[PDB]
Design a protein around this ligand. Structure first.
Ligand SMILES: [Cl-]
Ligand SMILES: [Cl-]
Ligand SMILES: [Cl-]
Ligand code: NA
Lengths: 5, 99, 99
């Protein structure tokens, strides 16, 4: 899991 | 503290009088928390990650303690997989990346 | 270096003989790069975040130069909007979070 803009 | 990254950098936060776990995320522009009640009005925001964009609720000037350090700033609320502390509050607590 | 978080912590990397920009991302378990070819075998993987999951290709034992520091590990390739250096390689260059 990876994670924001 | 100095936090290594062999494990996820999870810390305890306090928001709304409640303790939660959250991830210190230098890859996140913004702080995003799981559904909860916060005071005041909110405004709309879209945030994007690897799988696409989602609608969240933006609350400003929220008091949150992060690993013992007080911050007051913008907190987004929405369907995040994990509570995320992003750069807007990492800067307030004085965090840097070092290598 | 010591990197502040006022801005996205973007660095130059070298991978597959190509120079690219990438984000140092303590919130990412894995390293994910935009579509490119890499040598050797790969297998499919799903990775997720806000917005959902995406399918990627998993390459093992890939070397990457990260801001001048070489590391080896698994690299995922797929439709990511930003190249991300995740914890699996941040550890190898001795990156820590400090506050
Ligand atoms: Cl803020
Ligand atoms: Cl790895
Ligand atoms: Cl170490
Ligand atoms: Na390989």
């Amino acid at each position: 899991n990876l994670x924001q803009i | 503290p100095q936090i290594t990254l062999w494990k996820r950098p999870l810390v305890t936060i306090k928001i709304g009088g409640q303790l939660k776990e959250a991830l210190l995320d230098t890859g996140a522009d913004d702080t995003v928390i799981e559904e909860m009640s916060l005071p005041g009005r909110w405004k709309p925001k879209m945030i994007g990650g690897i799988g696409g964009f989602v609608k969240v609720r933006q609350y400003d000037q929220i008091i949150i303690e992060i690993a013992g350090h007080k911050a007051i700033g913008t907190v987004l609320v929405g369907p995040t997989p994990v509570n995320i502390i992003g750069r807007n509050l990492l800067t307030q607590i004085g965090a840097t990346l070092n290598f």
